[PDB]
Paper text:
Mammalian ATG8 proteins comprise two subfamilies, namely LC3s (LC3A, LC3B, and LC3C) and GABARAPs (GABARAP, GABARAP-L1, and GABARAP-L2). ATG8 proteins promote autophagosome formation, elongation, and closure, as well as fusion with lysosomes. The canonical LIR motif is a small Θ0-X1-X2-Γ3 motif, where Θ represents an aromatic residue (W/F/Y) and Γ an aliphatic residue (L/V/I) (whose side chains bind to hydrophobic pocket 1 (HP1) and HP2 of the LIR docking site (LDS), respectively) and X represents any amino acid (aa).
The ULK1 LIR bound the strongest to GABARAP and GABARAP-L1 with Kds of 50 and 48 nM, respectively, followed by the ATG13 LIR (Kds of 0.59 and 0.53 µM), which also showed a relatively strong affinity for LC3A (Kd of 4.1 µM). Our affinity measurements showed that the LIR motifs of ATG13 and ULK1 exhibited very strong binding affinities for GABARAP. In order to find out whether their C-terminal regions are contributing to GABARAP binding in a similar way as observed for PCM1, we determined the crystal structure of ATG13441–454 and ULK1354–366 LIR motifs bound to GABARAP at a resolution of 1.14 and 1.07 Å, respectively. However, residues C-terminal of the ATG13 core LIR motif were not included and ATG13 LIR structures in complex with GABARAP subfamily members have not been reported. The ATG13 and ULK1 LIR motifs interacted with GABARAP in a very similar way. In the N terminus, the main chain of the aspartate in position X−2 (D442ATG13 and D355ULK1) formed a hydrogen bond with K48GAB from HP1. Within the core LIR sequence (Θ0-X1-X2-Γ3) the interactions were completely identical: (1) the canonical LIR interactions previously described for PCM1 structure, (2) in position X1, a valine (V445ATG13, V358ULK1) was packed against the aromatic ring of Y49GAB, (3) in position X2, a methionine was engaged in a large surface of hydrophobic interactions with L50GAB/Y25GAB, (4) in position Γ3, the carbonyl of the hydrophobic residue formed two hydrogen bonds with the guanidinium group of R28GAB. In position X5, ATG13 has a phenylalanine residue, F449ATG13, which engaged in more limited hydrophobic interactions with L55GAB and P52GAB from HP2. A361ULK1, the corresponding X5 residue in the ULK1 LIR, made hydrophobic contact only with P52GAB. Finally, in both LIRs main chain carbonyls in position X7, X8, and X10 (P451ATG13, A452ATG13, S454ATG13 and F364ULK1, P353ULK1) formed hydrogen bonds with Q59GAB side chain.
Residue numbers in the entry: -14 to 117
Write the structure that this text describes.
C-alpha cells in the first residue's frame, strides 16, 4: 500500500576509498568485525583515516572501539585532541561522503552506514568537501 519514502544522497556517496581496506583483505576484516561486535556489543568498531587530499595531521591509530551512545560531536572533540588541533583549525568527518549530523550517535551511524565487514568507516579532513 504505502510507498517507502527514500532519502536523497549525493551521486558520489559511497565512493570512500580507505588505505585500511587496501591493506587488510575483506574476509579478515569481516571475520574480525563479526567477532568484535559479539565481544563488545555496546561498542562499534570504527576505522578513521584522513580523507584524500586533506591537509591535517595523521592519526597514529586507525581502529577505534567506540561506545554506541557517544555522539559525533563528542567524537570530534576526542579526535581534535589526538591530533593536537589548534583552536582555529577545522575538522570535518565524512561517512559515505557526507558530513554526519553532529548530534547523531555513533551507534546510529553504525546502524545506517556500517559496511559488510561490520566496521564503520569515517574519513576526516580540514576541508568540508571530501577529497577536495
Amino acid at each position: 500500500d504505502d510507498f517507502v519514502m527514500i532519502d536523497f544522497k549525493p551521486a558520489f556517496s559511497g565512493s570512500m576509498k580507505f588505505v585500511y581496506k587496501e591493506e587488510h583483505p575483506f574476509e579478515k576484516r569481516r571475520s574480525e568485525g563479526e567477532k568484535i561486535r559479539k565481544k563488545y556489543p555496546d561498542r562499534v568498531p570504527v576505522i578513521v583515516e584522513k580523507a584524500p587530499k586533506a591537509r591535517i595531521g595523521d592519526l597514529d591509530k586507525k581502529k577505534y572501539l567506540v561506545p554506541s551512545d557517544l555522539t559525533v560531536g563528542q567524537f570530534y572533540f576526542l579526535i581534535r585532541k589526538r591530533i593536537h588541533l589548534r583552536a582555529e583549525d577545522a575538522l570535518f568527518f565524512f561517512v559515505n561522503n557526507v558530513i554526519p549530523p553532529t548530534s547523531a550517535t555513533m551507534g546510529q551511524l553504525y546502524q545506517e552506514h556500517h559496511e559488510e565487514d561490520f566496521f564503520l568507516y569515517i574519513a576526516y579532513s580540514d576541508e568540508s568537501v571530501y577529497g577536495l
